[PDB]
Structure formats: structure tokens, C-alpha cells
Amino acid sequence: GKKIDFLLSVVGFAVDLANVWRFPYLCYKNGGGAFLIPYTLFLIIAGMPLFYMELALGQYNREGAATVWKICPFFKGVGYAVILIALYVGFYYNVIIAWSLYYLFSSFTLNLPWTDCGHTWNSPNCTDPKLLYSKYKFTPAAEFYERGVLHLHESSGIHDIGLPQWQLLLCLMVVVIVLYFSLWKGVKTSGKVVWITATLPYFVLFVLLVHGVTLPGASNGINAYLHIDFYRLKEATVWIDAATQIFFSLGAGFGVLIAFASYNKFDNNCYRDALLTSSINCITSFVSGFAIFSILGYMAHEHKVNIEDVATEGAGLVFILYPEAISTLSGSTFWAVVFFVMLLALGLDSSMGGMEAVITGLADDFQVLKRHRKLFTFGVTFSTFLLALFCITKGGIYVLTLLDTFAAGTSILFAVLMEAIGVSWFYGVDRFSNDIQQMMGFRPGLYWRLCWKFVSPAFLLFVVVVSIINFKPLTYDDYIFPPWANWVGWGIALSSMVLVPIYVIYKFLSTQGSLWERLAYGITPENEHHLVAQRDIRQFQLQHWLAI
Numbered sequence: 001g002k003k004i005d006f007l008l009s010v011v012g013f014a015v016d017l018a019n020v021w022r023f024p025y026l027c028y029k030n031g032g033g034a035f036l037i038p039y040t041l042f043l044i045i046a047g048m049p050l051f052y053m054e055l056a057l058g059q060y061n062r063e064g065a066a067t068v069w070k071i072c073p074f075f076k077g078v079g080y081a082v083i084l085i086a087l088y089v090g091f092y093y094n095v096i097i098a099w100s101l102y103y104l105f106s107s108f109t110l111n112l113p114w115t116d117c118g119h120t121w122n123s124p125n126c127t128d129p130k131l132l133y134s135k136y137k138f139t140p141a142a143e144f145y146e147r148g149v150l151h152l153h154e155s156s157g158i159h160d161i162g163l164p165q166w167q168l169l170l171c172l173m174v175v176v177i178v179l180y181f182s183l184w185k186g187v188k189t190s191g192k193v194v195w196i197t198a199t200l201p202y203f204v205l206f207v208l209l210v211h212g213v214t215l216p217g218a219s220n221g222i223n224a225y226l227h228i229d230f231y232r233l234k235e236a237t238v239w240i241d242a243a244t245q246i247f248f249s250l251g252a253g254f255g256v257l258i259a260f261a262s263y264n265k266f267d268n269n270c271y272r273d274a275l276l277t278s279s280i281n282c283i284t285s286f287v288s289g290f291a292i293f294s295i296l297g298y299m300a301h302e303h304k305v306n307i308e309d310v311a312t313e314g315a316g317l318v319f320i321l322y323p324e325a326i327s328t329l330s331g332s333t334f335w336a337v338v339f340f341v342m343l344l345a346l347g348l349d350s351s352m353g354g355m356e357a358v359i360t361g362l363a364d365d366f367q368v369l370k371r372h373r374k375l376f377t378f379g380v381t382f383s384t385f386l387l388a389l390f391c392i393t394k395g396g397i398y399v400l401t402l403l404d405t406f407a408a409g410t411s412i413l414f415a416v417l418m419e420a421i422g423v424s425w426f427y428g429v430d431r432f433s434n435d436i437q438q439m440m441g442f443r444p445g446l447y448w449r450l451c452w453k454f455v456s457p458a459f460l461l462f463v464v465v466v467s468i469i470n471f472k473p474l475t476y477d478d479y480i481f482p483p484w485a486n487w488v489g490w491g492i493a494l495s496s497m498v499l500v501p502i503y504v505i506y507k508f509l510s511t512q513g514s515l516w517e518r519l520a521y522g523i524t525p526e527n528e529h530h531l532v533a534q535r536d537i538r539q540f541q542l543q544h545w546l547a548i
């Protein structure tokens with residue numbers, strides 16, 4: 001049972017809300033197949049080494065994202081930045097679960113609300129295919145999602161978000177209460193019910209793929225998926241999106257991996273964990289893209305519109321597609337219930353992990369918080385509840401888009417780049433390899449060390465620079481955000497990006513001694529500060545820097 005339980009755990013942890021909800025619309029927005037080349041390249045080159053490095057760090061040091069930097073005290077700022085990024089993401093990661101809960105609640109009927117027009121929320125322009133460069137938006141499913149769930153028609157933009165919707169308010173309240181009561185007692189919350197949540201997503205994806213392949217218009221969608229438009233690979237939007245989606249789905253850059261590995265056994269095999277998780281994530285992403293493109297090709301055939309204009313490119317793509325695929329099934333009510341229960345469970349577990357990252361990171365830093373986990377959990381959950389209250393308004397989709405674009409974009413890329421640079425160069429790739437050997441029994445191969453030291457940081461810096469200089473103003477379908485919205489988004493990104501130099505400056509000023517003494521104390525492990533007085537620093541010799 002050692003291997004079967006491990007396989008269940010790894011397959012459960014290998015699929016996130018990202019793979020199911022965010023990958024579809026990022027793949028649709030980027031042409032389809034053309035998005036998989038950057039995705040797979042980045043996956044290997046950066047994602048696999050960074051996943052492995054974070055797991056090894058957490059396992060060896062037994063600390064959260066913040067306090068794990070006792071090895072290189074100057075990067076506690078990086079730790080704080082990743083914790084803040086996780087906190088930001090949790091603001092809308094819960095609104096998505098609220099949407100899923102609302103859909104599940106509305107799915108308990110023999111006549112699904114997303115099948116035809118004729119309801120209170122339908123506009124006079126609603127078009128029913130059975131009864132008779134834009135994105136359409138006049139279909140029963142799109143009309144339902146945008147009017148009877150979001151009530152987006154009552155807001156003119158991000159300047160007129162309006163008051164919170166009370167149905168989504170109740171759903172968010174339920175989600176937050178469940179999260180708190182699942183986090184308040186301790187980290188140990190697995191091995192009890194995750195069995196169903198680890199297999200259900202794969203079953204749902206399998207059934208959807210099998211059913212969608214046999215649809216009238218699925219062939220065109222599959223052709224559009226397997227057709228690669230190489231012109232799109234010279235714009236850098238696809239590359240930025242692929243990198244960000246990778247660091248989202250894999251879980252790196254949020255401090256989740258370090259916090260969760262801090263509870264692993266000292267002899268746990270992180271290399272096999274990273275390899276298996278990366279392979280599963282790649283296969284799942286490819287299958288999900290295939291099924292999504294099949295579904296939207298079927299819809300394009302159904303609605304007599306081009307595949308590029310059939311559906312939205314925003315965060316509601318799954319809530320438009322999956323109900324439309326369910327409506328084509330027999331006993332569609334049961335399938336809808338099953339799918340949305342799956343989505344609820346997956347989102348709940350993912351948000352639970354994201355919030356546990358923050359809780360552990362802050363509790364390891366301050367012992368008072370670690371002594372009062374109940375109050376700290378309540379405070380974190382209440383803050384998330386309010387800042388997600390901000391995202392359930394009538395124009396809440398615009399705020400959600402702004403967050404999903406800015407909270408972890410260049411910010412998460414920069415945080416991961418700083419993590420990699422810090423460890424590999426200042427702490428030492430040789431030291432990290434020695435630690436991994438002492439931990440798991442074998443030294444990492446040359447490929448891993450090269451990826452950690454040279455390849456991954458270079459690509460991360462390149463993508464960060466390109467995202468900064470090649471920045472497209474924010475938009476949501478046909479709505480162009482005003483400039484101050486972009487300024488606010490860049491301020492949000494900087495809020496977590498700037499914690500690195502700020503903490504470096506604070507650490508330098510707070511330390512006592514000469515400039516060289518300050519540097520030595522800053523770039524030396526906290527448990528080896530007794531060598532600073534002996535003027536024996538490895539970082540001050542060229543051998544340390546040229547070591548690979």
C-alpha cells in the first residue's frame with residue numbers, strides 16, 4: 001500500500017484548480033496548439049527544476065517560505081513576497097469556488113437554467129439555436145453565466161462595480177466558513193476524504209473527452225487545436241502566459257511547496273515526486289486542452305459562428321463550455337451535479353493549500369501566532385472574505401480579471417527568479433546538492449544543477465523583462481480598462497515585488513559592524529555566524545562562485 005497510497009496522493013496533488021479552470025482559457029486565448037510549445041518548454045526547463053528545488057528546500061530546512069531563508073538571511077524579503085502573492089491569489093480563488101457552489105445549487109433541477117432563453121435574466125437579444133469580431137454573448141449558457149449569476153449587465157465597468165450580489169455573498173460566506181473549519185485545527189487534513197477528490201477530476205475529464213470527440217463539430221475544434229500558428233510565437237504574450245500558468249498549476253512561487261514539504265519525512269524522495277507531478281500535469285493539460293477545443297468546435301458548429309468568436313476568452317470560459325457539454329449528455333442533471341461537486345472539491349482543496357501556505361509561513365516567523373492558530377486562521381479567513389467581497393460585486397468580473405492578471409504575473413516570476421538566484425548562487429548549488437545527498441541519498445545530476453544555476457534563472461529573467469517591456473493594456477473581451485486600472489494593477493504587482501530590496505535594505509541597516517561585516521552576516525547562514533568574526537567567508541572566494 002506504500003506505492004498505491006503515494007500514487008493516490010501525488011495524482012491528487014498534481015491537479016489544481018489551475019489545470020481545470022485557468023488552462024482552458026489561456027490555451028483558447030493563445031490559439032490552442034501554439035500555446036503547448038512554450039508551455040512544455042517552460043514546464044521542463046523552469047518548472048521541473050524549480051519544483052524540485054522548492055521541495056528539497058522545504059524538506060531539508062523544516063521551515064516555511066519566510067523562515068527557510070535563514071540559510072541566506074537577505075532573502076526573507078523573497079519569502080514575504082511569495083506569502084503576499086499567495087494571500088492575493090486567495091482573494092479570487094475563493095470567488096471561483098463561490099461560482100462553482102452557485103452552479104451546483106442551481107444544477108438541482110430537471111430543466112437546467114443554461115439550456116434556453118425565456119428566463120428573467122435573458123435579454124431580448126438572446127438567441128436559442130433549437131428555437132430558431134465580437135464574442136457573441138447571446139447564447140443561453142453565456143447569457144445565464146453573465147446575467148443570472150454575475151449580473152454583469154448591471155455594471156458598466158470597473159468604475160461602476162456596484163454592491164455585492166447577495167446570492168454570491170451567501171455562497172462565499174459558506175465557502176469561507178468551510179475553509180476556516182477545515183484549517184483551524186492543524187495542517188493534518190489529508191488522508192481522510194481526498195480519495196474521492198483525487199480520482200473524480202480524472203474521471204470527469206475522461207468522460208468529457210470521450211463524449212466531446214463524438215460531436216458534430218468536434219473535428220474542426222481538434223483541427224484548430226493541432227494547427228500551430230507560428231506567427232503567434234514571436235509576440236511573447238504566449239510565452240508570458242505559459243510561464244505564469246506553469247508556476248500556477250505546479251504550485252511553485254506561492255510558498256506552498258516549501259510549507260508542505262516542511263512536514264515531509266527527511267528521507268522522502270523529492271526527485272521522484274517532482275518527476276511524477278510534472279509528467280501528470282503535462283498529460284492532464286494536454287488532454288484538457290484537447291477536450292476544451294473539441295467542445296468549443298462543437299459549439300462553433302452549433303451557433304454558426306467562427307471558432308475564434310464562439311466563446312469568451314475570460315475566466316468564465318469553463319462555466320460557459322462545461323455546462324454546454326453537459327447539456328448534450330443523457331441525464332444531464334446528474335452529470336452537472338457530478339462535475340460541479342468535483343469542481344467544488346478541487347477548488348476547496350487548492351484554496352486550503354494556498355491558505356495553509358500563508359498560515360504556516362507567518363506562524364513559523366512569529367511564535368505568538370503559532371501559539372494561537374485559531375485566532376490567526378480566523379483573521380486570515382476574515383481578511384480573505386472581505387477582499388473577496390470586493391470581487392462579488394456587479395462589476396466583480398473586472399476586478400477578478402485585474403487580480404488574475406496582476407497579483408501573480410511578473411510578481412510571481414520575479415519571486416521565483418529571486419528564489420533561484422538566491423539559493424543557487426549565494427547559498428551555493430554545491431551546498432544544495434550536498435544537502436540533497438545527505439537527505440535523499442544521491443547527489444542531483446548535472447542537468448539539475450545546470451538548470452538551477454544557469455538555465456532557469458536566465459529564462460526567468462528574460463520572461464520578466466519581456467513582460468515588463470511588452471505589456472498590453474488590460475481588457476476584458478470588448479471592454480477596455482481605463483489607464484488608472486492598469487496603474488492600480490502595476491501597483492498591486494509592485495506591492496509584492498518591492499519587498500525584496502526593502503528587506504535587504506532593512507537587514508543591512510539593522511546589522512552592526514563594518515560594511516564587509518554587514519555583507520558577511522547578510523549572506524551567511526544564521527547558524528554559521530561564528531565564522532564572520534574569523535574572517536572566513538566562502539562567498540568572498542572565487543571558488544564558491546565558479547562552483548557548479
Ligand SMILES: CN(C)CCC[C@@]1(c2ccc(F)cc2)OCc2cc(C#N)ccc21
Pocket residue numbers: 012013014015016017018197248249250251254256257260346349350351352353354
Ligand atoms: C495556486 N494553488 C494555490 C497552488 C496549490 C498547490 C497545492 C500543492 C501542494 C503541495 C504539492 F506538493 C503540490 C501541490 O497545494 C495543495 C494542493 C491541493 C491540490 C488538490 N486537489 C492541488 C494542488 C495543491
Ligand SMILES: [Cl-]
Pocket residue numbers: 018019023245246249285
Ligand atoms: Cl496547467
